[PDB]
Every structure is written in C-alpha cells, then in structure tokens.
From a paper:
In the paradigm F and related R1 plasmid systems the 192 kDA protein TraI is the substrate of the T4SS encoded by the tra genes (Everett and Willetts, 1980; Reygers et al., 1991; Lang et al., 2010; Dostal et al., 2011). This bifunctional protein includes both the relaxase activity and a helicase that assists unwinding of the T-strand. A second group, which includes TraI, have larger, internally positioned signals.
Analysis of the protein crystals on an SDS-PAGE indicated that, in fact, an even smaller fragment had crystallized, TSAcryst: N-terminal sequencing of the crystallized fragment showed the fragment to start at residue 570. No attempt was made to characterize the C-terminal sequence of the crystallized fragment. This fragment of TSA crystallized in the space group P41212 with one molecule in the asymmetric unit. The structure was solved using the single wavelength anomalous dispersion phasing method (Rice et al., 2000) from a SelenoMethionine (SeMet)-substituted variant of TSA (TSA contains six methionines), and refined to a final resolution of 1.85 Å. A model was built between residues 575 and 786. The crystal structure of the TSA domain of the R1 plasmid is composed of three structural domains named ‘2A, 2B and 2B-like’ for reasons that are explained below. A structural homology search using the DALI server was performed which resulted in the identification of domain 2 of SF1B helicases as TSA's closest structural homologue: the RecD subunit of the RecBCD helicase ranked first with a Z-score of 8.9 (a highly significant score), followed by other SF1B helicase structures. Thus, due to the high structural homology between TSA and SF1B helicase subdomains, we can conclude that TSA is part of a helicase structure, its two first domains, 2A and 2B matching parts of the structure of the 2A and 2B domains of SF1B helicases. Thus the 2B-like domain of TraI constitutes a previously uncharacterized addition to the helicase fold, which here serves as a signal recognition surface linked to substrate transport.
Residue numbers in the entry: 575 to 790
Write the structure that this text describes.
Amino acid sequence: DRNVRYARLAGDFAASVKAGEESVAQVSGVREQAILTQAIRSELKTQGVLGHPEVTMTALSPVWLDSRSRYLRDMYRPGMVMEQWNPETRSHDRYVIDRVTAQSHSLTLRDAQGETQVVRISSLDSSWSLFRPEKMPVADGERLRVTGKIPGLRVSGGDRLQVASVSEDAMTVVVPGRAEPASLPVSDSPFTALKLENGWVETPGHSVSDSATVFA
Ligand SMILES: [Mg+2]
Ligand SMILES: [Mg+2]
Ligand SMILES: [Mg+2]
Ligand SMILES: [Mg+2]
C-alpha cells in the first residue's frame, strides 16, 4: 500500500538527513512528489530535524513555455503570474493574469499598483515568463530549491537553501558560499513571492526508475 511504503521511505530518508549523510528522494510524477514530500516533512519533525511550527508563504514555480506552446491560449490561466524582462532598468516587471479572452486571444494583466493593460497573446516572445503562485509551509530546518533569481542573493535556479529560522516576519537562510545567514521576506502576495519551492524530493522526469525511491 502507498501510504505504508511512503511512511517507510520517509523514515529512511529522515534518519539519513539527521545523520548528516547524503540522501536523495525520487518519484515519477508531481502528485507523488507532493505526497512523499508530506510524509518526509512529518517524519523529519518526529525525528527532530525540522521544527514543528510552520509558516505559510506564497512562492512561485516556473511553467515552461517555448516557441511551440507560447501562443496557445489555455497555457494561460487567471491568477498565474507573468514577468516581462525590461532591457532598461535590467528588471523583471511582474503581473497577475486577471483575464484570458478567447475571442480576441488576449490577456488582461494587473500590476502591483493595480494598473491593468491588455496584451495580445501574439506579442509574447521569449522576454516573458509564466509562474504558478503556490502556498507552501516552511519550518525551521527546511530544505528549499531555488527556481529563479532571488532579490539580494547571488543564487540561481537549481541551488539549495537551508532555512535556519522562520517566523511570520522573515525567513533566514544559509546560502552556500555566503558567510552570514541572509534574511528573506515571508510573502503573502504573488507580487512579493520568491522563486522557491520545497527541496526535499527531486523534481520528476529523468529518474533512476518509476518507483518512489530513497537513496540513503
Ligand atoms: Mg516579510
Ligand atoms: Mg516568502
Ligand atoms: Mg516566497
Ligand atoms: Mg525570487
């Protein structure tokens, strides 16, 4: 049974993290990634590795677009976030999708000030990026995966951060090759949300096998 098998995987995975040993958890799909992640966090709390209190925050996960998909209307859903790279300002301008209009193949975008504009799905090109805002729980000791540049940090997509402490007001993280812990915001809006996701389980797609597996 799955809940039984995942409980035992979590027990092995947590015991190895507690000992400071290298350990990796893989699964074959995003649903299993969420379920095994819940089982692993429960067990890391029971084994003393992750704090019991948790803080929820909005965070962003990339939705991949390329020349074949970028102009397909249903790739866009109300409440996703889009960013456009600004060549002057060297800055990503951020919006929320309020509306996707069929007939006219148009998005209505709203900015942090609450200003809107209509963009033709047509003018998008590779200067735009799409994200899903997700709410996620974070506790003291969390392992996070970086999914994009984080304001104020030198980290990149694919880096790992370890959460040293988290509260309603700030999350402090240990940054590989940075001396001091860095303080980051605890977001409750798509406009302040950081490009992070939980990092205990690997992203699926290029795994050793289809079965949920702990390498410990
Ligand atoms: Mg904050
Ligand atoms: Mg945050
Ligand atoms: Mg965030
Ligand atoms: Mg960020």
